[PDB]
Design a binder for this molecule. Structure first.
Ligand SMILES: *C(=N)c1cncn1Cc1ccccc1
Ligand SMILES: [Fe+2]
Ligand SMILES: [Zn+2]
Length: 327
């Protein structure tokens, strides 16, 4: 029903087909906000999307081709299924052994707590996940343990010259780069607890990462070698999640890693800038470029509610999804 009605209303031609020109009008209906702005879609990208749904190449989208378009593209743009992913908002990264405010950029991690809690209070997400760095005491990422594991011949620094925040390269095939951190987020420790003032909503799901002594996992998805993953992706699929809102600590390390993996996994991905803090101004900007160049978007807390409710529908996310629907 509603669908044929939509197709009918944009088939100006009345020829039971959709030209590129009539499709461009669909896009202008889709990619706008409700504060009076219509987003600009480059004509090149316009045809890129169009060609996804013109599955035979006839230069038209007929009512048979449009089924795929309506069910799998238009419906997600107008009614996304939103997951909120709160990364590593843990004691050791705010006031303990790895207080981000002591890193180079001197940013204060406690400041993300207010806007995150406000989002949790005002936006009805379809799922909320909280990740926790969850390291065993013998974890490879600690300066404390650099002597436990043989170093690679490629590494500039060995167990006797390495200092906290240096990068070493461990042997054990394959060779493995690892930045060394103070002991942090050890399992069952105060430093691994979620910050006491972070709201843990009742439906919230905790995802534990970094548990293998031999490999780190900055990302809530795959570990740093992309060998093993958490069950986050499987849990997202069980919820029908289409869109992932990512925040937390640190912007340029775990948040960024998680956001890039979410894009790799195929999700429409939104990084909430002011709900994040990072360790280094230059690496934060490199993280932003990565997300932007892979068709994620970066937004402020105040934009999230209208996006999640489908009242502010961004064309970068529409393009992401059309490119993913190629396969
Ligand atoms: C991810 N951000 C992460 C997980 N374990 C260590 N790190 C890096 C880091 C966290 C907090 C502050 C500074 C660096
Ligand atoms: Fe860690
Ligand atoms: Zn066609």
């Amino acid at each position: 029903s509603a669908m044929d009605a939509c197709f009918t209303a944009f088939d100006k031609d009345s020829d039971d087909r959709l030209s590129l020109a009539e499709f461009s009008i669909i896009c202008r209906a889709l990619f706008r906000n409700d504060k009076g702005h219509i987003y600009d879609v480059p004509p090149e990208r316009l045809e890129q999307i169009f060609a996804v749904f013109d599955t035979n190449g006839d230069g038209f989208i007929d009512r048979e081709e449009f089924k795929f378009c309506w069910n799998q593209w238009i419906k997600t743009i107008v009614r996304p299924v939103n997951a909120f992913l709160i990364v590593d908002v843990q004691n050791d990264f705010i006031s303990g052994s790895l207080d981000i405010s002591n890193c180079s950029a001197q940013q204060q991690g406690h400041e993300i707590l207010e806007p995150i809690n406000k989002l949790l209070d005002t936006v009805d997400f379809d799922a909320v996940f909280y990740s926790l760095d969850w390291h065993p005491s013998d974890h490879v990422s600690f300066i404390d343990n650099v002597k436990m594991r043989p170093m690679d011949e490629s590494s500039a620094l060995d167990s006797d010259s390495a200092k906290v925040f240096d990068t070493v390269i461990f042997a054990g095939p394959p060779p493995m780069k690892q930045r060394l951190w103070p002991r942090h987020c050890v399992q069952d420790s105060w430093g691994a607890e979620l910050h006491k003032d972070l709201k843990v909503v009742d439906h919230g799901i905790k995802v534990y990462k970094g548990t293998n002594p031999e490999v780190d996992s900055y990302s809530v998805f795959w570990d740093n070698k992309k060998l093993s993953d958490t069950t986050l992706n499987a849990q997202l699929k069980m919820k029908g999640a289409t869109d992932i809102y990512v925040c937390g600590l640190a912007y340029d390390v775990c948040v960024g890693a998680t956001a890039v993996d979410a894009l790799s996994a195929g999700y429409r991905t939104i990084l909430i800038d002011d709900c994040c803090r990072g360790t280094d101004v230059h690496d934060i900007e490199h993280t932003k470029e990565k997300v932007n160049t892979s068709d994620g978007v970066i937004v402020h807390t105040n934009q999230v509610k209208a996006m999640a409710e489908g009242r502010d529908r961004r064309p970068e996310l529409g393009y992401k999804l059309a490119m993913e629907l190629k396969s």
